[PDB]
Design an enzyme around this catalytic site. Sequence first.
Site, PDB file in Angstrom:
ATOM      1  N   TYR B  51       0.783  -1.249   0.015  1.00 41.75           N
ATOM      2  CA  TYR B  51       0.023   0.087  -0.072  1.00 41.75           C
ATOM      3  C   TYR B  51       0.817   1.218  -0.005  1.00 41.75           C
ATOM      4  O   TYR B  51       1.691   1.348   0.899  1.00 41.75           O
ATOM      5  CB  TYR B  51      -0.932  -0.076   1.326  1.00 41.75           C
ATOM      6  CG  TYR B  51      -2.458  -0.056   0.876  1.00 41.75           C
ATOM      7  CD1 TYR B  51      -3.084   0.977  -0.044  1.00 41.75           C
ATOM      8  CD2 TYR B  51      -3.274  -1.281   0.967  1.00 41.75           C
ATOM      9  CE1 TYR B  51      -4.355   0.874  -0.290  1.00 41.75           C
ATOM     10  CE2 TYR B  51      -4.394  -1.362   0.605  1.00 41.75           C
ATOM     11  CZ  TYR B  51      -5.124  -0.382  -0.251  1.00 41.75           C
ATOM     12  OH  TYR B  51      -6.381  -0.733  -0.677  1.00 41.75           O
ATOM     13  N   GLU B  53      -0.675   4.625  -0.717  1.00 38.00           N
ATOM     14  CA  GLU B  53      -1.696   5.754  -0.983  1.00 38.00           C
ATOM     15  C   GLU B  53      -0.814   7.172  -0.933  1.00 38.00           C
ATOM     16  O   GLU B  53       0.004   7.338   0.013  1.00 38.00           O
ATOM     17  CB  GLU B  53      -2.823   5.734  -0.347  1.00 38.00           C
ATOM     18  CG  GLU B  53      -3.639   4.604  -0.392  1.00 38.00           C
ATOM     19  CD  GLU B  53      -4.639   4.532   0.747  1.00 38.00           C
ATOM     20  OE1 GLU B  53      -4.464   4.371   1.852  1.00 38.00           O
ATOM     21  OE2 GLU B  53      -6.191   4.400   0.501  1.00 38.00           O
ATOM     22  N   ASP B 197      -6.113  13.549 -25.570  1.00 37.32           N
ATOM     23  CA  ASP B 197      -6.050  12.050 -25.004  1.00 37.32           C
ATOM     24  C   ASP B 197      -5.231  11.203 -26.170  1.00 37.32           C
ATOM     25  O   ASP B 197      -5.757  10.860 -27.310  1.00 37.32           O
ATOM     26  CB  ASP B 197      -7.498  11.298 -25.097  1.00 37.32           C
ATOM     27  CG  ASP B 197      -7.477  10.039 -24.619  1.00 37.32           C
ATOM     28  OD1 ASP B 197      -6.503   9.413 -24.536  1.00 37.32           O
ATOM     29  OD2 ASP B 197      -8.737   9.565 -24.309  1.00 37.32           O
ATOM     30  N   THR B 223      -3.015   6.073 -22.105  1.00 38.01           N
ATOM     31  CA  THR B 223      -2.624   4.722 -21.792  1.00 38.01           C
ATOM     32  C   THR B 223      -1.326   4.304 -21.850  1.00 38.01           C
ATOM     33  O   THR B 223      -0.404   5.163 -22.658  1.00 38.01           O
ATOM     34  CB  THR B 223      -3.406   3.625 -22.639  1.00 38.01           C
ATOM     35  OG1 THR B 223      -3.185   4.000 -24.033  1.00 38.01           O
ATOM     36  CG2 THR B 223      -4.918   3.668 -22.594  1.00 38.01           C
ATOM     37  N   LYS B 226      -1.097   0.207 -25.613  1.00 37.52           N
ATOM     38  CA  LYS B 226      -1.162   0.300 -27.037  1.00 37.52           C
ATOM     39  C   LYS B 226       0.033   0.738 -27.735  1.00 37.52           C
ATOM     40  O   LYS B 226       1.000   0.079 -27.658  1.00 37.52           O
ATOM     41  CB  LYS B 226      -2.327   1.646 -27.360  1.00 37.52           C
ATOM     42  CG  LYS B 226      -3.602   1.350 -26.533  1.00 37.52           C
ATOM     43  CD  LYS B 226      -4.751   2.316 -26.725  1.00 37.52           C
ATOM     44  CE  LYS B 226      -5.902   2.108 -25.895  1.00 37.52           C
ATOM     45  NZ  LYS B 226      -7.130   2.808 -26.099  1.00 37.52           N
ATOM     46  N   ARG B 232      -0.506  -2.698 -19.045  1.00 36.92           N
ATOM     47  CA  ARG B 232      -2.123  -1.990 -19.169  1.00 36.92           C
ATOM     48  C   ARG B 232      -2.241  -0.896 -17.894  1.00 36.92           C
ATOM     49  O   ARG B 232      -2.196  -1.358 -16.646  1.00 36.92           O
ATOM     50  CB  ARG B 232      -3.238  -2.812 -19.245  1.00 36.92           C
ATOM     51  CG  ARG B 232      -4.461  -2.642 -19.835  1.00 36.92           C
ATOM     52  CD  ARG B 232      -5.282  -3.997 -19.898  1.00 36.92           C
ATOM     53  NE  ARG B 232      -4.739  -4.447 -21.142  1.00 36.92           N
ATOM     54  CZ  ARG B 232      -5.347  -4.402 -22.461  1.00 36.92           C
ATOM     55  NH1 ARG B 232      -6.074  -3.413 -22.760  1.00 36.92           N
ATOM     56  NH2 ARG B 232      -4.740  -4.939 -23.255  1.00 36.92           N
TER      57      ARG B 232
HETATM   58  C1  LIG Z   1      -8.007   2.868 -25.131  1.00 33.86           C
HETATM   59  C2  LIG Z   1      -8.317   4.415 -24.846  1.00 33.86           C
HETATM   60  C3  LIG Z   1      -9.004   4.834 -23.595  1.00 33.86           C
HETATM   61  C4  LIG Z   1      -9.145   3.895 -22.291  1.00 33.86           C
HETATM   62  O1  LIG Z   1      -8.117   3.151 -21.860  1.00 33.86           O
HETATM   63  P1  LIG Z   1      -8.484   1.949 -20.880  1.00 33.86           P
HETATM   64  O2  LIG Z   1      -7.113   1.623 -20.450  1.00 33.86           O
HETATM   65  O3  LIG Z   1      -9.159   0.872 -21.682  1.00 33.86           O
HETATM   66  O4  LIG Z   1      -9.425   2.394 -19.783  1.00 33.86           O
HETATM   67  C5  LIG Z   1      -9.235   6.264 -23.340  1.00 33.86           C
HETATM   68  N1  LIG Z   1      -9.091   7.134 -24.649  1.00 33.86           N
HETATM   69  C6  LIG Z   1      -8.566   6.602 -25.815  1.00 33.86           C
HETATM   70  C7  LIG Z   1      -8.187   7.757 -26.901  1.00 33.86           C
HETATM   71  C8  LIG Z   1      -8.139   5.198 -26.019  1.00 33.86           C
HETATM   72  O5  LIG Z   1      -7.659   5.111 -26.920  1.00 33.86           O
HETATM   73  C1  LIG Z   2      -8.942  -0.640   1.225  1.00 31.36           C
HETATM   74  C2  LIG Z   2     -10.257  -0.060   0.981  1.00 31.36           C
HETATM   75  C3  LIG Z   2     -10.913   0.507   0.013  1.00 31.36           C
HETATM   76  C4  LIG Z   2     -10.360   0.868  -1.220  1.00 31.36           C
HETATM   77  O1  LIG Z   2      -9.658   0.177  -2.132  1.00 31.36           O
HETATM   78  P1  LIG Z   2      -8.261   0.410  -3.103  1.00 31.36           P
HETATM   79  O2  LIG Z   2      -8.177  -0.757  -3.621  1.00 31.36           O
HETATM   80  O3  LIG Z   2      -7.364   0.938  -2.216  1.00 31.36           O
HETATM   81  O4  LIG Z   2      -8.883   1.512  -3.882  1.00 31.36           O
HETATM   82  C5  LIG Z   2     -12.336   0.859  -0.205  1.00 31.36           C
HETATM   83  N1  LIG Z   2     -13.343   0.591   0.944  1.00 31.36           N
HETATM   84  C6  LIG Z   2     -12.742   0.050   2.038  1.00 31.36           C
HETATM   85  C7  LIG Z   2     -13.244  -0.624   3.196  1.00 31.36           C
HETATM   86  C8  LIG Z   2     -11.121  -0.463   2.176  1.00 31.36           C
HETATM   87  O5  LIG Z   2     -10.821  -0.773   3.180  1.00 31.36           O
END
Ligand SMILES: *Cc1c(COP(=O)(O)O)cnc(C)c1O
Ligand SMILES: *Cc1c(COP(=O)(O)O)cnc(C)c1O
Lengths: 405, 405
Positions: B51, B53, B197, B223, B226, B232
Amino acid sequence: MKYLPQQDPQVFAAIEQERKRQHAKIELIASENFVSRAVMEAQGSVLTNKYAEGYPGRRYYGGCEYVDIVEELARERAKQLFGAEHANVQPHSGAQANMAVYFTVLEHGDTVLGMNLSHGGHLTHGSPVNFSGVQYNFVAYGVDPETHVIDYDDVREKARLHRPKLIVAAASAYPRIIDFAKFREIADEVGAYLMVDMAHIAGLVAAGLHPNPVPYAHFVTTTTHKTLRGPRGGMILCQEQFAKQIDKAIFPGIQGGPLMHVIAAKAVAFGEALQDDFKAYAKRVVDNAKRLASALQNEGFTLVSGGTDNHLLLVDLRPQQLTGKTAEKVLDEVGITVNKATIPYDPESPFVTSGIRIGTAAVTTRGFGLEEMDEIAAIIGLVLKNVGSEQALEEARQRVAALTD
Amino acid sequence: MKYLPQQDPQVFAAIEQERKRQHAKIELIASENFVSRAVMEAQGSVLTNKYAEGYPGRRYYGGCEYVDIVEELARERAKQLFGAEHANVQPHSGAQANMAVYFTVLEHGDTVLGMNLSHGGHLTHGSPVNFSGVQYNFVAYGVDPETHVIDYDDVREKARLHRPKLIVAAASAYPRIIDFAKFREIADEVGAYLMVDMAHIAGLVAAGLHPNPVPYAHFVTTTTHKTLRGPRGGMILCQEQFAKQIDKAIFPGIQGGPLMHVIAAKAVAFGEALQDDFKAYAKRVVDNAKRLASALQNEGFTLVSGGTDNHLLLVDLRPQQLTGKTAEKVLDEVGITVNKATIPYDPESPFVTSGIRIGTAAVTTRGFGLEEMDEIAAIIGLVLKNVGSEQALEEARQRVAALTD
Ligand SMILES: *Cc1c(COP(=O)(O)O)cnc(C)c1O
Ligand SMILES: *Cc1c(COP(=O)(O)O)cnc(C)c1O
């Protein structure tokens, strides 16, 4: 590793430092755990290469036959584990799981009732600097000032006064069992949906060591990491009547392409959780937490709610005239990892606090038992009672080293 | 793999199927690529256990010294690569990168101007079933009906009429270079922020083969997968004046804990992109796309915009009296992976379409060159001109097999 050391010496050196750190330190951060080698291999797989927007058998792209098998394994194993009618294993995180449920049932500005953020509620349960508190009108219920147990009459009164569309139950720093039946009864009285965020307790729920929210909640959200000991990510469980809406909320609602390699790792983790030895593990988690709680009280520490029913405890440091921040800092000096935590009705700010939060999931995974709990408590006592003694801190350092070998 | 095969035969068998599929098929889906073994090792690391954050040196949890090094490597390498003043490498996905930028500068119901979704715009650029179109008031600019190039006078007119707070430039199915200077000029005229984007073109931007949006845009999203050929996930680049706000938007705004193992993999990918051989790779991508475009035209196919300036092309199948759906299906039968795609002013629904989208990033990574482009075009010609001939389809199958070895 074979290829990383050659390709990227800098990244590899840092990773190696982190791996060695994970072994050397006593990890007591309640949200932390150590995943299996199989889980890691799964998310280090070629599945990162596949776009699979949509759902199994209902994808936007061809060639998803095998990632479909993987996702379905994740969904079916999750349903077995929790007895849910539907699972969505695509959420990128616990935050995104919650985000999707909110997107499903709420409109901008709708009222939501969640646990007071200073009493154990999570950031995503209405913080004014989080999308939840910005997008929706969050109100809070509290724990009792003495027992530190959720005041169910307060939940009820807040619900009746504010008329939330959604009630959220569950917590990131609550050491007692949550009564989901009572939450549902209150939700029913006011015609609100009930969402249970079981992120912290999901492993315990899977092992039958905490009551299961699935039968009482319209929606259950969770992390796949934490007590469930899976890869980092989220999941939603719900009754079949909300399945279509929940799926649409995740995609095309709030996410794009899912992380198929992480979903593979989720499947692996759920497989592990279905085994008898995970049930034994989870019992040791809870047993160790009780023992640690008891041992800390033996050292003279006050615990929020007077102990624990689960994997975590909170030390109220006011009797020792210490802040959570001071405790966190000095424990870091000896190789014990905790975090500062607000205690109910804390006189300090959330950035200083009067408490530390401690969980046993990580040390239990490493094979720590009751004897180790006693020693951890003794070391914590030695440190926090002697914050100005370098001699004491060095002894603690050596005792921590003895535990981690 | 060592541990997965023993622990989870089912998951392993499916992964192995997917790996073999990736080798066997000709991947022409424009968003797809194949990451390096080093990238995969990085996200299969123990960093999933941490973790973290917050941000480097400003974390909520202790013990982040080494994951801080990793994240900073990612940020600094991203800044080198794109010449950005600030990078946020935490976004879980391209969707979440966009989500964060929207959360930063917009209020619920604000007007945003983006590319028409039937002309190349992305789901997250205002689809009414996506959070973007639900949360904000999206309006669209179009391409010219004949040239299929963005009509910059239309961008300008829409901006002046609708007075958007934010203009979005960039696309998931646009085969020509985007003029970011003109977008910024229009944004300036109407006092709107400009977001670019660059998800599809990020690798080409890194290699200097497409103009860089960084100097013209207030915010650049992308991203990491790509054309950039990373793991990813998502990323945001911006000028230093928005750094604090963007960081707060990601956390505590829209996400919780970042995926540190994926961030490690991002660092690795950026490291690879900084090398001379990535520049050569990206040139081959663009060269191969031109060659494929030319070769397809030789077969008698019509291309949207009459060719390509980048990694992707769109075939307008109306002259052959075929839908994109039919083409996608039959090409799947012979081992060529494409997706159906709406063409500008498409008479068909988005679920049928008159087009297919094709990109060369994946096949180029596999080592395909100009000769292979000619053969791919010839196979596509053979298939789409003989959709009812099993003899033709079998020949195509064999020719595809010859290419993938
Ligand atoms: C692929 C793409 C996204 C989204 O990415 P994810 O990782 O699939 O959420 C957003 N904007 C553009 C222009 C993209 O090509
Ligand atoms: C850890 C936690 C989250 C958030 O998870 P992430 O993967 O850090 O986004 C949300 N709700 C509760 C109760 C959590 O303990």
